[PDB]
Amino acid sequence: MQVILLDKVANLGSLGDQVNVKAGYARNFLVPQGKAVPATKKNIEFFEARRAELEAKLAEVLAAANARAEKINALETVTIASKAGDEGKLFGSIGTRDIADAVTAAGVEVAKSEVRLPNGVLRTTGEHEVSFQVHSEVFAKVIVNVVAE
């Protein structure tokens, strides 16, 4: 494919490459997410002066703004005080919804889709490490303290 790239792909993308990829990767991942634009004799002219000169640094400062959005919450901890069972065995498993609402109500205003859970649905009541996908390289180290009630 002659598809020019826009985002910093961690495998082959380095902001302006013409690396040959398959059509299923470009049509289903790169185009609908805004990661890359198919270049056929006019998008090359669009990327030549209007995109690589101004909008690449705009994407870089939007990545810096995502880093600042990570740097909004300086505490980087969430104390969940939901209702629990008798001596452990928590009542309801907390998914990404309640964690996203607790971080959004006080701290980072990131959406639910960037929230990732390394240790499952967090059935064990205690200290847990939760990372956020605010950026493709820099990750979060949120310390969630599940407290039994």
């Binding site: 008798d86 001596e87 452990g88 065995k89």
Partner: protein, 100 residues
């Protein structure tokens, strides 16, 4: 009421949660209108053979006078729990004292 000598083993990170279970069990004892006799926690020590691995389990003796309905409910709370592994209830034989 009959004297029932309860011995049960607990897993270690849930043996950190043993005194709350002791408070719940003595609340059931207070509901049984019986007096507790042996609050001697034997403690966390080494097992003799692999019983559902991560060794050195927690021994607790109870030795309380109780009726039959309360001990049936307290045995169903034993068998239906992942924390209580190997509980047992023994005879009366004029229930006993120190130097275990």
């Amino acid at each position: 009421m009959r004297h029932y000598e309860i011995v049960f083993m607990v897993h270690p990170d849930q043996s950190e949660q043993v005194p709350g279970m002791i408070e719940r069990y003595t609340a059931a004892i207070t509901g049984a209108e019986g007096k507790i006799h042996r609050l001697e926690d034997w403690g966390r020590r080494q097992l003799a053979y692999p019983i559902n691995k991560l060794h050195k389990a927690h021994y607790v003796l109870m030795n309380v006078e109780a009726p039959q309905e309360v001990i049936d409910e307290l045995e169903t709370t034993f068998r239906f729990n992942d924390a209580v592994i190997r509980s047992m209830v023994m005879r009366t034989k004029h229930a006993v004292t120190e130097a275990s």
